[PDB]
Amino acid sequence: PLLTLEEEVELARKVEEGMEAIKKLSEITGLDPDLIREVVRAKILGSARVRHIPGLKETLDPKTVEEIDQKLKSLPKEHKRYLHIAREGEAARQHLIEANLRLVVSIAKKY
Amino acid sequence: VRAAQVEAEEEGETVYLTLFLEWTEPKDYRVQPHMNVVVPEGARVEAGDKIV
DNA sequence: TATAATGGGAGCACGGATGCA
Numbered sequence: 001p002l003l004t005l006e007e008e009v010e011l012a013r014k015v016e017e018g019m020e021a022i023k024k025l026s027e028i029t030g031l032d033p034d035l036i037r038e039v040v041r042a043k044i045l046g047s048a049r050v051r052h053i054p055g056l057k058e059t060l061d062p063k064t065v066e067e068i069d070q071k072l073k074s075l076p077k078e079h080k081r082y083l084h085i086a087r088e089g090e091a092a093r094q095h096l097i098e099a100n101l102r103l104v105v106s107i108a109k110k111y
Numbered sequence: 112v113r114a115a116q117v118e119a120e121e122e123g124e125t126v127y128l129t130l131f132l133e134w135t136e137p138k139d140y141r142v143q144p145h146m147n148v149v150v151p152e153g154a155r156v157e158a159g160d161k162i163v
Numbered sequence: 164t165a166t167a168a169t170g171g172g173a174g175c176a177c178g179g180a181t182g183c184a
Contacts, residue, residue, distance in 0.1 A: 002169060003169095005144045005145075006144045009144065009145055010147065013147065099169090100169065101169080101170095102169035102170060103168070103169040104169085105169080105170060105171080106168080106169055106170080107168085107169090108171095109170095109171060109172090
């Protein structure tokens with residue numbers, strides 16, 4: 001179903017604050033923002049999809065995603081907040097992309 | 112409103128009651144579509160705490 | 164990279180084999 005103004009702004013907000021949260025976890029943990037983002041995304045998408053990203057310096061496998069996930073969950077509550085923020089951020093991103101798919105069709109029909 | 116403590120002073124044919132009263136005064140806040148509520152239902156806030 | 168825009172458009176004839184009622 002198509003979003004509303006409040007829903008759109010909500011998802012957008014969660015996405016932006018999610019990316020900010022990823023940057024925060026990068027500042028805290030000292031890891032690569034791309035790696036953290038890909039791990040969070042991996043946990044959001046679930047066991048359905050795991051694949052190596054060309055940009056990452058390390059290969060992406062469930063062992064690694066578990067290591068990094070448990071490495072993120074070992075943080076204190078205030079630092080563990082950004083994890084939840086990032087997760088809900090990725091979820092919001094998925095819902096946001098899935099919501100706008102009609103626009104793409106309406107644009108592509110002219111091409 | 113509920114009366115917590117009641118002090119009574121006897122004067123002539125009358126009594127003067129000093130009432131310690133506790134009540135709640137409601138105030139509405141209209142929320143626009145571009146704003147989000149950061150507080151849960153029935154939560155206790157304080158002075159300076161952000162609601163919306 | 165910034166008004167908002169959110170579901171398409173075209174277009175005969177007989178056989179064996181299997182699928183279904």
